[PDB]
Amino acid sequence: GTSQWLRKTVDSAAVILFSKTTCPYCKKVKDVLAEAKIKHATIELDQLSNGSAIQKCLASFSKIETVPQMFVRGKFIGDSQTVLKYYSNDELAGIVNESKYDYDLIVIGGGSGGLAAGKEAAKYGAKTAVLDYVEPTPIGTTWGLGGTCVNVGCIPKKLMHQAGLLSHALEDAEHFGWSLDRSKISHNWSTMVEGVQSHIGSLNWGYKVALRDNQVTYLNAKGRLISPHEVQITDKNQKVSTITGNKIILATGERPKYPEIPGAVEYGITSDDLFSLPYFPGKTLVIGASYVALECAGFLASLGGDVTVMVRSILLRGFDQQMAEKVGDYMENHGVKFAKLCVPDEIKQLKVVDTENNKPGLLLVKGHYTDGKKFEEEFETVIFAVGREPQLSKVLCETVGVKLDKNGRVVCTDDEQTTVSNVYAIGDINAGKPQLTPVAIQAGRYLARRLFAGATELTDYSNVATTVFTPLEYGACGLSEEDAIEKYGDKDIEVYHSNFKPLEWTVAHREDNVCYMKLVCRKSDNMRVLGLHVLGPNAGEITQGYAVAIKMGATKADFDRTIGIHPTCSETFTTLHVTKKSGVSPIV
């Protein structure tokens, strides 16, 4: 048991020390490495149950049982003195620093997971290189380091959400007494895009800095794994070179799909273009139903745009459909038009995008409804959010044996290992895992600690909370109501729910009985909270805390004996009492 673990650890760590807190010559060599600016992992045997056996099983590797014991890339490098003996004659640089390969770790893709993994690995001695490149969109849009979230995802998405929410803040401010000229307030897209792009620019550059500050080599180069330990890089000159690493982390993410219809690539855009668009989109058609589609339709409308969403079948497939319908219901009642049960057939261009005056072109979208009537309408902008797909054929010489699935994602063990044992996959390309930035970050950091500091903890992908940043936000943790009934049967499921009304909405004359929340519980398992769902303002702030309790096995009674904070939206979870089976109405 313990020896399978120590075998992996010693082979994988680049620079690691085993030590004790209460023993001198442990303390003694740490300070010397410090002084020498040589980074390393450390395992305080005094602080593990296992430590007993390990310092003893350790002698299988060193012929030794003293602490300290220092290893480098799988090989014992000595005692108290043999290492001082290396600083001694100044030979502790080419010792800690030589490897079969150029790097302990090459990370391919510089997004949420890849930068997080790279950084944490460098923190324990790993010689690390991060590759990143951004294949432009069909119109030539590109961006800097940081990945989908930072550049064309949650970050700009949420800022434009915020700008949208300020619309309702400007409305609300009048009823709270502010002298406000709503007959003279407009929104300027270019000003907003420039502020958003300036904060993105500062994150692109904060990430370069951060890589430099942690002795990580950043390469603006496309990476192709040609063999388990070999990565071919092509740079901005199209110059081709080869580099070698012991561990490889694939973290290349996905890019938007287009539908295969005439004029879609040529005249439509995706989220990749939206957030740096020079010109206001104007009257916009969003094609799709993902949380991406509704988030974008949502703030465009709150920015005053004329917005339409084309929905092939249902909203937010994969999410609790009662909540999805409530989300959709709020947007329809606040400006968003929905062309329901409708697909596109062609996009025909009527006007070309004016680089001159930064104004959109004009498109004719032709489509058909399920009922056979034809869709034909003009839009200045058409945005596809019909899903996202990995681009790995462009990264994995399929000679190398990294097994992909149907959808092009990487088949992984529970510790992120691919079918090539030194190659791991994190983030959106890891088949079957939730596709979210914090997941990718915990995966990369936790994996980096297993590789290079002997950690054991795996990433827990279960009950990962989400929030959809539609005009009215929807946060969730755990199962939808339909999935809990599927798994356990209707009679084993109790659902407590309630409408509520933000105090902020009262003076502001917003809706009663629109915001809503519910706990899905297992009668047979002590009313274990299996899924939490909340529709209302600040739904992410609300939900996050409860994801800790749920991960701990919260039951209904745990919610009930917690005392609310007043006045908040979140406190309503601590007083829920109407059940669905009751028939009683959740209104307030």
Ligand X SMILES: C=C1C(=O)C=Cc2ccccc21
- Which residues carry out catalysis? 566
Q: Report which residue type is found at 144.
A: G
Reduced 3-state DSSP string for 466-500: EEECCCCCEEEEECCHHHHHHHHCHHHEEEEEEEE
Query: Judged by CB, which is closer to ligand FAD: 117, or 550?
Result: 117
Residue with tokens 């805390």: 545
From the list ligand X, a copy of itself, ligand FAD, none, which binds 217 (C-beta under 5 to 8 Å, kind-based)? Answer: none
For the chain, how many residues are written? 588
The answer to whether 311 contacts ligand X (rule: CB under 6 A) is yes
547 touches which of a copy of itself, ligand FAD, ligand X, none (CB within 5 to 8 A by kind)?
Answer: a copy of itself
> Is residue 568 a contact point for ligand FAD (CB under 6 A)?
no
Stretch that binds a copy of itself, among 91-99, 177-185, 246-254, 517-525 (CB under 8 A): 177-185
- Shortest distance (Å) from residue 143 CB to ligand FAD: 8
Q: Are strands 41-44 and 103-108 parallel, antiparallel or unpaired?
A: unpaired
431: CB partners within 8 A, 6+ apart: 404, 405, 407, 409, 410, 411, 412
DSSP 294-345: HHHHHHHHHTT--EEEEESS-SSTTS-HHHHHHHHHHHHTTT-EEEESEEEE
Q: How buried is 162 (Cβ within 10 angstroms: 0-12 exposed, 13-18 middle, 19+ buried)?
A: middle
Instruction: For residue 279, state whether it binds ligand X (rule: CB under 6 A).
Output: no
Q: Which of residues 204-223 bind ligand FAD (CB under 6 A)?
A: 222-223
Binding ligand FAD by CB under 6 A: which of 54, 106, 129, 149? 149
Query: CB under 5 to 8 A by kind: which of a copy of itself, ligand FAD, ligand X, none does 349 bind?
Result: none
199 or 351, CB closer to a copy of itself?
A: 199
Q: Give the pair of three-digit tokens for residue 430.
A: 């890891």
Candidates 47-55, 122-130, 389-397, 502-510: pick the segment binding a copy of itself (CB under 8 A): 502-510
Please state the closest distance from residue 567 (CB atom) to ligand X, in A.
26
Q: Is 118 in the site for ligand FAD (CB under 6 A)?
A: no
With CB under 8 A as the contact rule, the residue among 136, 318, 432, 545 that binds a copy of itself is 545
> C-beta of 375: minimal distance to ligand X in Å?
14
Q: Which of residues 339-368 bind ligand X (CB under 6 A)?
A: 340
> Residue 506, interface with a copy of itself (CB under 8 A)?
yes
Segment contacting ligand FAD by CB under 6 A, of 24-32, 50-58, 130-138, 367-375? 130-138
Distance (Å, rounded) from C-alpha 264 to C-alpha 473?
A: 30
Residue 223 interacting entry, from ligand X, a copy of itself, ligand FAD, none, C-beta within 5 to 8 Å by type: ligand FAD
Q: Is residue 325 within 8 Å of residue 516, measured between CB atoms?
A: no
Helices (H), 321-436: 321-332
Taking the complex as a whole, the smallest distance from the CB of residue 141 to ligand FAD amounts, in Å, to 12
Task: Choose which of 173, 210, 314, 364 interacts with a copy of itself (CB under 8 A).
Answer: 173
For 367, residues 6+ apart whose C-beta sits below 8 A from its C-beta are 310, 339, 342, 343, 344, 345, 374, 375, 376
CA of 186: how far to CAs of 170, 253, 304, 444, 451, in Å? 11, 37, 8, 43, 53
* Residues 301, 334: Cα–Cα separation, whole Å: 8
Helix axes 189-213, 154-175, angle to 10 degrees: 140
Phi, psi dihedrals of residue 22, rounded to the nearest 5°: -95, 75
Residue 440 makes contact with ligand FAD by CB under 6 A = yes
Distance CA 176, CA 542 (A): 24
Structure tokens at 226: 């040609």
Q: How far apart are CA 374 and CA 361, in angstroms?
A: 23
Angle between helices 2-12 and 437-453 (to 10 degrees): 90
For a copy of itself, what does the binding mask look like between residues 456 and 475, x meaning CB under 8 A?
-x--x---xxxx-------x
Contact partner at residue 243 from ligand FAD, ligand X, a copy of itself, none, CB < 5 to 8 Å by partner kind: none
Cβ atoms within 10 Å of 514's Cβ, excluding its own: 18
Partner from ligand X, a copy of itself, ligand FAD, none contacting 148, C-beta within 5 to 8 A by type: ligand FAD
Cα 454 → chain centroid: 25
173 binds, among a copy of itself, ligand X, ligand FAD, none (CB under 5 to 8 A by kind): a copy of itself
471 binds ligand FAD (CB under 6 A): no
Binding ligand FAD (rule: CB under 6 A), the pick from 157, 449, 510, 518 is 157
Among 65, 325, 405, 525, binds ligand X (CB under 6 A): 325
Q: Which does 329 bind (CB under 5 to 8 A by kind): ligand FAD, ligand X, a copy of itself, none?
A: ligand X
Q: Which ranges in 79-147 belong to alpha helices (H)?
A: 80-88, 92-96, 112-122
Q: Which is nearer to ligand FAD, 504 or 511 (CB)?
A: 504
Beta carbons of 271 and 151 less than 8 angstroms apart: no
With binding defined as CB under 8 A, does residue 180 bind a copy of itself? Answer: yes
Collapse the DSSP code of 20 into the 3-class scheme (helix H, G, I; strand E, B; otherwise coil) and give the result.
coil
Task: Return the range that interacts with a copy of itself (CB under 8 A); candidates 101-109, 316-324, 364-372, 564-572.
Answer: 564-572
Contact between 131 and ligand FAD per CB under 6 A: yes
User: Least CB distance from residue 95 to ligand FAD, whole Å?
Assistant: 32
Closest CA to 33 of 99, 64, 77: 77
Pairwise CA distance, residues 298 & 161, whole Å = 8
Q: Which of 315, 395, 520, 529 binds ligand X (CB under 6 A)?
A: 315
3-state secondary structure of 423: strand
Residue 343 or 464: the one with the smaller Cβ distance to ligand FAD is: 464
566 binds ligand FAD (CB under 6 A): yes
Asked whether position 482 contacts ligand X by CB under 6 A, the answer is no
Pairing mode, if any, of strands 342-351 and 337-340? Answer: unpaired
Which residues of the chain form contacts with ligand FAD (CB under 6 A)? 108-114, 131-134, 147-149, 153-154, 157-158, 222-223, 251-253, 271, 292, 394-395, 427-428, 435-438, 440, 566
Q: List interacting residues with ligand X (CB under 6 A).
A: 311, 314-315, 325, 328-329, 332, 338, 340
